[PDB]
Amino acid sequence: SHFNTRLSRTFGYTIKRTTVKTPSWAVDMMRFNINDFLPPGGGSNPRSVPFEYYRIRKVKVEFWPCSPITQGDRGVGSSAVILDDNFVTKATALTYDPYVNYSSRHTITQPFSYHSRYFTPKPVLDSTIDYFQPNNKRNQLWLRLQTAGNVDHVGLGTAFENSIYDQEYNIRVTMYVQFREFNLKDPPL
Amino acid sequence: SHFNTRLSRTFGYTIKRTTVKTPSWAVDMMRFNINDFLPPGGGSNPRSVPFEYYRIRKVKVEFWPCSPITQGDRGVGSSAVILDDNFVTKATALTYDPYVNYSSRHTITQPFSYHSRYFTPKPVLDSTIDYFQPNNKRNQLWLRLQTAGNVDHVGLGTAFENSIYDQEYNIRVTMYVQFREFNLKDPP
Amino acid sequence: SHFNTRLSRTFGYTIKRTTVKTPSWAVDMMRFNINDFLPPGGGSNPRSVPFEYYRIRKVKVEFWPCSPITQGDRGVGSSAVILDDNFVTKATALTYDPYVNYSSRHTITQPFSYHSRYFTPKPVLDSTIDYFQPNNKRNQLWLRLQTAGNVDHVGLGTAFENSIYDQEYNIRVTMYVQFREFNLKDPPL
Amino acid sequence: SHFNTRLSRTFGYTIKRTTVKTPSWAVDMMRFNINDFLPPGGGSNPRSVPFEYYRIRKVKVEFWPCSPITQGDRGVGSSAVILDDNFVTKATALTYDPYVNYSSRHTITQPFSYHSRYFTPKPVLDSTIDYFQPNNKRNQLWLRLQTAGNVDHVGLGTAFENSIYDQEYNIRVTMYVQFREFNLKDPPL
Amino acid sequence: SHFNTRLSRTFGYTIKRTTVKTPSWAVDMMRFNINDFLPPGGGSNPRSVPFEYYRIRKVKVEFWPCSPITQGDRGVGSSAVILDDNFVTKATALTYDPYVNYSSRHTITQPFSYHSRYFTPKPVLDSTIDYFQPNNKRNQLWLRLQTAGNVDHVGLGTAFENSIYDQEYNIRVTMYVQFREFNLKDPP
Amino acid sequence: SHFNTRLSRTFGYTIKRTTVKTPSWAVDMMRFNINDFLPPGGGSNPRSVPFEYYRIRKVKVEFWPCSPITQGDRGVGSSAVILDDNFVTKATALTYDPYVNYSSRHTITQPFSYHSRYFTPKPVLDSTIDYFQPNNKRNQLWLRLQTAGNVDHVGLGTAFENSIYDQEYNIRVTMYVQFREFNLKDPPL
């Protein structure tokens, strides 16, 4: 009846070099949607894992640095966990790191170091009120596993210190998902 | 403050005879809405149970067969608990039983045997996301008892093997409802 | 099977000023009928609580005074529990408190004090013999919940000392009613 | 990191005098919205408390009578807790107290008595279905602290008995709020 | 890291009426193949469950009778478990029940009764030699889950007594399968 | 109510390259003012946290180097904790490390190594006498949270060995502050 597993994807992230002489920050964000982890299935089974319900238990975000350990103009930034879908506005060179004081902030060391965050994300159930459940096991909502309109889950704010060089990362995101209700259809012939 | 009780209703259901040779299934669905269990009130008490809030603790679905124990071309099918309001599409003769592999499937025996299911159903709170609470007691959402526009609760998918004969049933649905906040008005 | 609840109604009561000089009392009486607490329902459920039988466990009579704490010509009277439906004849200015010697008498203070009584009342089953059951829990009679012609229960004699001024009360009566046998009918449409 | 705190505001309420001779009740209602307790902030901290999320643990509604203890035509009303945003229709002189039989009812004494209610209110999350969580602690929904458009929380029905006099109160609402996720921005210059 | 589940299918079986007057038996066989339970998937996930390996733990063969409990010319047959893929030759009216003395034989009551067998079947690994493992759990072979042409497992010989009437059945086959090695692909 | 929290800010520091032959030290200093951590408020809540009083428990000073770990001409320097606002005089290239024998000295490794200090700083109460309290919890002076002209706290002296290459750091200063007496004003509208 229940199936625990782990799903992953890796995409590129560049912070383009700047020439601002004062410390600045590249502010951005990250949501998580199961459509980017589970491709569509086939025939009478529209998704590739044949289950009717899911809930995302945990997300791990890993920033795998591309820069060599020889690279200079090293900086210091912040990742914070944003559970209400209310991120700081996307900015190229903000004059301060807007996430540093966040209670959930962790320091990102730049540009040749790993960084990861691991936490329970929340679904965006109503973007007007922006409400979510307390971090939990037994009482977490079950969601329908849809084919294509899956609800955004929510997650992570970032501010990377700008540099005189480019700072490239491979980002790997991994969802620890609990699926429920085996639904495999089996047509004949 | 609380009131636990049980509301029932009965309706007919006929699977119509077919001539298709090979096995085939009549796929349907079932929802439960308190509108059908709870008639309106009168005057200042707009509902027959004078309470402000309720939740549905359990639904029991009973299929009481009409066919006699003598009837042939007996079949086998499935019921499944669908808590997300995403049922298999309605179908007169699907070439397989699309519910048979469901985790929540129970076997239905046809045409002259009883079948029942008993589970906690879920309200349809947002049909786009289709979210629901884990099976629980004290943490279950309370709902407003509305005179008319009450929310669908969600439940049961079905597949009856088609037959050379008609297969008629009386379906008795029973909700075990918890009501809260007695609200009786008493004009003069 | 059992539903224990509480139903209330509030009504006006005025004791009109006099200019008799000698102390004199307004004598009256109080019955309790579920018709006054339970309106009619609609359709196939002719009463507003859908039960077949009932009995009244306790009644509470509250005299809420309207007169201000500054009102003079204070006076003294009596409330008595009368379970046999035989109240003292109603009177405007009787020359004594006809209830002061009753075993169940409690003293009413006038005209700005609260006064409450709490007791098991009895149904008026045969007004000629006027018999009733001893105050008791498991053995108390069950009565059919009628729409229309519910039986009086019986309870309270009052004698308020009259005064140079008007004495006004809001009276709130509360029945603690046990209901039995859920009977809800559910027609279609 | 959480911060518990208490927030208050005070406003007037008047029940205008009437000449209706029979007992009648002024019926109204109270919702609670955090926009009225937390003013707007300044600069890059939009809200005067720099937290990302809140939830309302408790609400105290206090009715502070203005009328002096010498006032006459005293009355008796009702407060009830309404958690589904479905109150009785506002009415100047209803012929009964519509809230007296409510399970959550408390008696209100008029016109010179203090009345409080204290309880967990509920956010108005969908006014079509009007659902809410059972009164809990650690499972309670978290909400985004908005600058402008916060969600009503829901709460209190009232029925005051009408009077030959004006009946004034200062009402003081007080929200016991829990805030979560410190988020202070510190731009430079 | 592992995933137990259950997969089911149903099909018809008819034993056509005869007028041979002395007792005779309709003799047949049953093999089980996971292609019939587990359809193709999509894209880069060629199977509808994304596992690399499986093994079949157990099969249940359920003969659900179609004949009504009123039907006469009732008879008596045999099922047997054949683990080595060597069944008695298919026959219409064999003059004895060739499975009745088999150690694994169970009795089949005809025509209106349920019958089931539940056992560990075996893969057909080499059909010249026809070897198989002792019924086990932790030493049981893993097999690749193929898209295409999965290996038969082996299983059930039947012998139903013939009748003056037709004898129809819905046969339900159920595979308790254990999958291993989640292998889901996720192209962008 | 006490509210315990953390406030940070980051700024650049560059030691400019020299061609002095012999070992020389760039001597400098650091004070901490909450002005630089807490932007102003708005309306009747003139500061971004709404508390009347504060004291600084602890400061973290972090030197996050910019130079790569490949850089040569490495050196060795000193930090020291100066609680009496009496720092060695600022100097481009002093011919010794003036803080090496301080009791509170920690060794700094240059130019690619992190360095931190964590200590209880002291307010500058009277810079004629320069007095401070011994490091404590329950006895530390409370100070008023001012909008504009808060009191320098004091702290850290630095001596970095000069180099043939430049040596940049991002410096992150973090104040662990305890605030007391919630004071939020809530006007209407």
Residue numbers in the entry:
A (entry chain p), C (entry chain r), D (entry chain a), F (entry chain 9): 43 to 231
B (entry chain s), E (entry chain q): 43 to 230
Kindly provide excerpts from the paper associated with this entry.
Currently, PCV2 is the dominant pathogen causing PMWS and a number of associated diseases in pigs, severely affecting swine production worldwide. Notably, PCV2 capsid protein (233/234 amino acids) encoded by the open reading frame 2 (ORF2) of PCV2 is capable of self-assembly into VLP and resembling the icosahedral morphology of the native PCV2 virions. The PCV2 capsid protein is the only protein responsible for PCV2 capsid formation and the dominant immunogenic host response. In literature, the crystal structure of in vitro assembled PCV2 VLP derived from N-terminally truncated PCV2 capsid protein was determined at 2.3 Å resolution, whereas the cryo-EM structures of in vitro assembled full-length PCV2 VLP was determined at 9.6 Å resolution. These structures show that PCV2 VLPs are assembled from 60 copies of PCV2 capsid proteins with the icosahedral symmetry and several exposed loops located on the viral surface, which may serve as the immunodominant epitopes eliciting neutralization antibodies.
Instead of replacing the NLS sequence by a non-NLS sequence, we completely deleted the N-terminal 1–45 residues and replaced them with a fused N-terminal His-tag “MGSSHHHHHHSSGLVPRGSH” derived from pET-28b vector to make PCV2-His-ΔN45. As expected, no stable PCV2 particles were observed in solution, as confirmed by TEM, DLS and analytical FPLC. Single-wavelength high-resolution diffraction data was collected in Taiwan synchrotron radiation resource center (NSRRC) and scaled to a space group of P21, with the cell parameters as a = 194.12Å, b = 201.88Å, c = 231.28Å and β = 90.72° at the resolutions of 2.8Å. Surprisingly, although PCV2-His-ΔN45 does not self-assemble into particle simultaneously in solution at relatively low concentration (no more than 2mg/ml), the crystal structure of PCV2-His-ΔN45 showed that PCV2-His-ΔN45 capsid proteins indeed self-assemble into VLP within the crystals. At such conditions, the crystal structure of PCV2-His-ΔN45 displayed an icosahedral VLP structure consisting of 60 capsid protein subunits with clearly observable 2-fold, 3-fold and 5-fold axes. In our crystal structure, the interpretable densities for the PCV2-His-ΔN45 start at residue 43Ser, and the densities for most of the surface loops, such as loop-BC, loop-CD and loop-EF etc, are clearly visible and easily traced. Although the extra 20 non-authentic residues “MGSSHHHHHHSSGLVPRGSH” were introduced to the vector expressing PCV2-His-ΔN45 protein, the traceable non-authentic sequences are only two residues long 43SH44, which are located within the interior region of the PCV2 VLP. Remarkably, in our crystal structure of PCV2-His-ΔN45 at 2.8Å resolution, the traceable fragment 43GIFNTRL49 (the numerical is based on the authentic sequence NO.) is located along the 1st β-strand toward the interior core of the VLP.
